[PDB]
Design a protein around this ligand. Structure first.
Ligand code: HEM
Ligand code: HEM
Ligand code: HEM
Ligand code: HEM
Lengths: 468, 461, 460, 461
């Protein structure tokens, strides 16, 4: 019975998984890892292509997997609650995702396939590739060149147990599917214990928030959200599953991209940038990313502050000319925190324009691959397994990459591409002295390579359980 | 060339140790641990009485110690910078302090001895004892009953190495001095990794800030400064060293007090208070201290809320009647945040009484245990004027029953003598009930010292 | 050159990898993990079926794998030496094995396929199954019911890294092969840090030894060799690779069996046995296995004694009537230490030994009691499967009359189960009958050959 | 009752601390750390000189320390038992030792002072120094140049708590004694978790054994002692305390020596030796010490075996020509395992020279580093006769060039003065080459003490 209103407006404290009220049925039929990350230290990603002419036994397998393993949002919350209260660790965590091709394999009518246009086109689609600035599909890792039908995600803190359970699951799975690709994701940490990505920066700091446990935690640590509200409405991440079987059956769209990071070359380019500007290497890093390695926002400081829990309580209102945090910095390109509402609004509707800007946000659930020692500097074979959720790929991930990160004239003319993820690489203007207007041009090179991926839908659990 | 102006007004971002500008010479000749704490996990405190008739060899020893070991504020900042940037751990940290009696031992002329009156009088002085409400000197631990000339402080994160270095240092030291007392300080922590004191409360939260690294961290991570500005001027902590060699030779006055904490009895009294008011035990704690054990200010909340960086950008403007945080609570007694001004001139004066705390713990290192005796706080603080700062805070704020208002009662944590407080029955409502919270902290000994400029110590012989 | 003499007689200190003498060329072309275990904490086992009509590209893949990853015995020894001397870890460990079906897929002429008869027949063969007392092939786990061509084994101490490297390897591999089954092996330990198996017993103690580093360690730290000599000749494990590129090209035959252990039921049966005999649970365990859980040989003691290096320099000469260690106990069945010879007969008895390279699967917490899904990935090497593993199972463990009439089957591994006679009091003759049940289930496996490296490097 | 027989013959399984039988009174009145090491990870050593004319208050202090802190052998065993059985940690461990000078300070009559001649002479005695090959007393560290009366030893696994307890103990102690020197001992370990000394070799492997727990553990791990019996009779370590309160009152003589180890130079010398002989560096180490770094005996192997618990089950009967383990190697010099008997009576006499080691490390705690000075071994050992045990071992075995055979040369590790050894070119073959391995251990000070019975100390005042 959830209305338009209920989906467009998050409660003030978020959705309370212990007292869900009208969101109870939703949480029971929605898969986990969407509204709140599964939080497990290890994961396995199995990309599947179902075997020809085996539709009925495939459906039986999916059904059994949904009955036995898939974790709902309610189950995810209950497992976290039982762990905190009684030290009892829960079952493995599991998600199941379908591509558009997967829906076709399953003989679901076109009109019943999730409607998102990028999801239907697929990440190999030439128009999609062109719009993202992505490389040719022939450059992708072999696993991703196959037609992918589905993704199985299994996660757990105990790696050896995770491997055993995966090996059990795969016995029946292999009868009906080719496993065309596998990843074993993990969480990289720095010596302070912060979660980082391979270039050494704390990662996952700024997220749309939905669940009470997150909202309340973030509020107490971010000054009552007095500079930035991280809450987001449910309709920025959920969509009705057109084939769900409850009054409140929802899913979300997944973007999966394997992003290789050339750490050695990145560090060299960062040092060179620092030498050219005659600044500290750590500040050069902060100008590229928008934060110091520890998470300190460069809009707020020209030095790292080393807080283990970095602040998210800022906007760029004290930095309108972007002489502290440049317009090109990754954080400011991907989350303008109002820049588009000021700079690109001429009818004066700041509030409406800011709401629209905020509607482009993505909910990240990324993990690392490759080298697990963060002191090392891999050239290839290490990076980020980029996963994010949204209700509209065209308006969220694709928008963020194609309209914000890539273009040289966003948010203002001659900003240049995002030096971390913008394709193609180009020219940025860097402040010589933090907080002062004079800049110098430097072409920071793109040290991230797209190695493959796909768009999926996370269906409602009831859909999956009644497929056979 | 630092002027009156430079000393009375801190720069907006504090003193930048990596780009010190006009403060460069000051930072080279000022000892560390004053403007910013040494931050090491372990320390050794050696209290000295120099041996009679050995003035010249004592001076030679002090000179060698200053040349080899003493850490300047600049060196301290450089060691932290090298550690962050390259993982290289620095030398051991060291301070050296002299008492007035120590200056006299060294045959320094009276006009050249630091001028602070409490420092000159000494912590054993009867007037000082009476003013502080302190116990009789005959009750102090034996080590502190000796005439103390100096204090050597050595600190390091690696405890075993620290002990070896100390044992090396003490070989030549014992030739020229009696070590009359030793402490081995350490940092107590809660399960979240926050620094606490033996009663279980997060500790060292609210400080005067001077250095850029501290000022910016606080501003960025603790919600800016619009309710409470933690910056302080240099003249609230530094004093020109009358015997320094440089144009910018400064020191500071140290108060050292060994404060024994009866954890078992404190917890019992806290439970009895809670049960008398029919409130949660954690809230009873918060009414005694002014914060919950997790650091949550009781003026802002009647429950703990677990902020990772405990809140400090607040004042009592939403709590004028003190029915959330009582006037008697330790934090509100020791930092009234404008109560005395209730303006601008009066608040500046009020803020001039602040102290810069550099305390460490002694005794039991397992924070789950409940020692009765032999555990507590090695209370160290710095200031430019002991009469106006530590002594003022203890004698005029914490102890009196009529500060800040009539019948407030003494600070139930540190006030001497103990007395009667009025406790709100319901947080945020006016009705109170009287309860005599007992004093569970005992003064076991201490002394006042001066941290001299490094150049003074390096050219003493 | 290696002569018959060199293969039939191990040097007194074993083969010295750092000064190999006449064995130098052999160690260069022989895969690791055979003469000495790879010693890595984690492993991944990938069972392969090559895709139809892709023989040439399969050969190219195998060749690249042999050039890039396969660890020789010389490389294995060098990696251990560099690790001890300089702390440098070095590469992942890798083996590659072929089944007879794999040889046929690769269009290798029959006269060139390794000659061992069980190997050629395959572990699914009905005569093999019957001989071993094995269950029907339809009861096997699904992965093992496919026709298996090859096994890729990759191992490393750093599990996360191992997983990344495996995922890299499998990208090109999947183009030319189905991965029909996977295991992730790991090492179970007790609180003292000794390697154990799921029933709780220290495991991997008694082995044929070949390399100096093993021989000397064992001699120095395990009380010399005067009661039991653990050395074995190279011809008890190595076989000439008919397709190697020199006369010094050797391989070995691998037996792989997934053996599920019902820990819960085993412990109950052990407790019931102990109650029936009115003895301590731990002694009942020792009578089943031949050792206490801590490794203490039950022939030597009726109590555990916690030796750090579990004892292996013993025989049953003080226990001829088997009233301390019964004739049915697992250790005494699988290694009679002279019972069958009661000189030439003892040498023959010792020729049946197997070199074990097993690892665990399933539950990694050894305090738990899984019913199914946990056990031992049993791997062993030999030069002659008929005379070694198959002999040990079919002629020693299984039969009721080995080593003497009415001994009964090995209560741990004997198939089918039956009746054992158990001493009421250790060291005294009176026994009582009890049918210990079989709590190990064969879930699948295959026989393979580990070829010489030069064969694999020049296959395309 | 204890008879001559009981003291000259250890029971087959050693003394059972849980069931002591005839040894019950002995274990109550005997200090710990003698028959079995205290096994604590940290210790503090306080060397004392009692203050002139304060004999009676010194006696009262010693009495209170014996009543409150000193650990008997029985208490030590009970604390270990409770810890294993219930996880309950015990009190700190403590010993108290007196020098001959300390006995004289306490006005104990000469006939009542322990009779051992080296003990009475003192380690500063010129004839003692000459006999040991020791350096001039003026080269010792300053702390050891004082007249030392006593040594207080306090030990615990929890370093911070140990420090606090020591600081408490020293308050009353300082009233009646000068603390002339302090060490903070610790246990150095290699990456495998084995206890090592600074040169990197596993240390403490071969010991005389007395207590059942040790005897049984060692027996099971050493092949039922079939090559070497490590047991020793009680009279090789215990001495009747002439001033104990019963006939079951015993003590032992302590040798304490601070031995500095030049790790950097030792490693260079080892590498030079290896290059000259064209052998592996690890084997060169084994030829110096008698064992590889991991403990593997070089008499048994020319390669390390890396067993975490090294074997002790060997003698040199497979190596009579000493071409595997040279006659000069430290282990073979200090424990010939029958070389001097080459029988039964001579081997018994040879075994009577053994010492029971209770050493700990000082200085650098990171074993990967290579200190030149300031790091080493705090060498402690016990015996019933210093002349026949430690002094005999150093002066008659380690030092002489003609022990055990002509032109063996000094022990290259500890022999003073240094000289020439003959090293086998190829392990197990006779041809040798001369190389002068240098002495990289420096004696920095020490003293001989007696560990008195507890009853003596408890009734001293
Ligand atoms: C290997 C590739 C990438 C790296 C290393 C990376 C790194 C980071 C870092 C260090 C942060 C700052 C801390 C945080 O809030 O998490 C961040 C934030 C973020 N990144 Fe990325 N990023 C990557 C790819 C992407 C891509 C492809 C997108 C979207 C198209 C994206 C969108 C975001 C967003 C939305 C934020 C949060 C901005 C905010 O709310 O302040 N990132 N990224
Ligand atoms: C064992 C004795 C003491 C204990 C257990 C103790 C405990 C605490 C605690 C828990 C806080 C709150 C957190 C913080 O800001 O650090 C605090 C604050 C403080 N204490 Fe103490 N204290 C002790 C002695 C003293 C003494 C003797 C003084 C001065 C005479 C003092 C002055 C202060 C001041 C100035 C603050 C900061 C108040 C603010 O700015 O809000 N304390 N103390
Ligand atoms: C899950 C199945 C099995 C378990 C739990 C198991 C367990 C053990 C145990 C605890 C030992 C004693 C310690 C040792 O020397 O390793 C051992 C020894 C041994 N086992 Fe097994 N075993 C299993 C299967 C097999 C099979 C199938 C064979 C051969 C057909 C075998 C052959 C041996 C041999 C040869 C020894 C060494 C005996 C000796 O030399 O004293 N085991 N086994
Ligand atoms: C810094 C000085 C010394 C070092 C580094 C050192 C090192 C060692 C090492 C590595 C061992 C072999 C393992 C073991 O403990 O059994 C050992 C054994 C021994 N050392 Fe020392 N040692 C030192 C000084 C001394 C001195 C001064 C003596 C006697 C005068 C001595 C007597 C012994 C004895 C008796 C053994 C055992 C011999 C045996 O029973 O096999 N050591 N030493």
């Amino acid at each position: 019975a959830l209305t338009e209103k209920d989906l467009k407006n998050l409660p003030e404290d978020g959705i309370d998984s212990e007292n869900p009220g009208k969101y109870r049925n939703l949480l029971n039929d929605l898969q986990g890892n969407i509204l709140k990350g599964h939080g497990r230290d290890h994961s396995v990603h199995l990309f599947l292509q179902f075997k020809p002419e085996q539709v009925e036994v495939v459906k039986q397998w999916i059904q059994s997997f949904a009955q036995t393993y898939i974790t709902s949002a309610k189950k995810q919350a209950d497992e976290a609650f039982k762990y905190r209260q009684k030290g009892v660790s829960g079952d493995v965590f599991a998600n199941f995702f379908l591509s558009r091709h997967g829906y076709e394999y399953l003989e679901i009518e076109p009109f019943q396939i999730p409607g998102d246009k990028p999801f239907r086109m697929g990440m190999k689609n030439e128009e999609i590739r062109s719009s993202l600035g992505d490389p040719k599909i022939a450059t992708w890792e072999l696993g991703f060149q196959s037609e992918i039908h589905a993704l199985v995600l299994i996660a757990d803190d105990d790696i050896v147990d995770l491997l055993q359970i995966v090996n059990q699951i795969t016995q029946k799975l292999r009868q009906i599917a080719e496993i065309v690709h596998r990843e074993d994701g993990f969480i990289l940490r720095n010596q302070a214990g912060q979660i980082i990505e391979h270039f050494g920066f704390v990662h996952g700091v700024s997220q749309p928030l939905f669940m009470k446990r997150d909202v309340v935690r973030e509020r107490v640590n971010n000054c009552d959200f007095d500079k930035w509200d991280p809450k987001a409405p449910l309709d920025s991440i959920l969509v009705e599953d057109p084939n769900g079987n409850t009054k409140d059956s929802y899913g979300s769209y997944l973007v999966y991209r394997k992003l290789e990071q050339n750490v050695k070359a990145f560090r060299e380019d960062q040092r060179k940038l620092a030498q050219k500007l005659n600044i500290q290497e750590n500040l050069a890093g902060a100008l590229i990313v928008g934060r110091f390695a520890d998470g300190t926002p460069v809009t707020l400081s020209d030095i790292p502050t080393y807080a283990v829990t970095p602040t998210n309580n800022f906007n760029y209102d004290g930095d309108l000319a972007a002489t502290k945090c440049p317009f090109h910095s990754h954080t400011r390109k991907t989350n303008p925190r109002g820049d588009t509402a000021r700079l690109l609004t001429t009818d004066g509707h700041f509030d409406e324009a800011f709401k629209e800007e905020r509607g482009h946000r993505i909910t990240r659930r990324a993990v690392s691959y490759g080298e697990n020692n963060p002191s090392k500097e891999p050239v290839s074979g290490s990076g980020l397994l980029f996963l994010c959720f949204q209700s509209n790929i065209e308006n969220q991930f694709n928008f963020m990459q194609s309209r914000w990160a890539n273009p040289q004239n966003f948010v203002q003319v001659n900003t240049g591409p995002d030096p971390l993820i913008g394709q193609p690489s180009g020219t940025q203007k860097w402040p010589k002295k933090w907080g002062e207007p004079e800049t110098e041009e430097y072409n920071f090179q793109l040290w991230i390579n797209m190695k493959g991926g796909e768009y999926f839908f996370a269906p409602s659990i009831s859909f999956l359980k009644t497929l056979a």
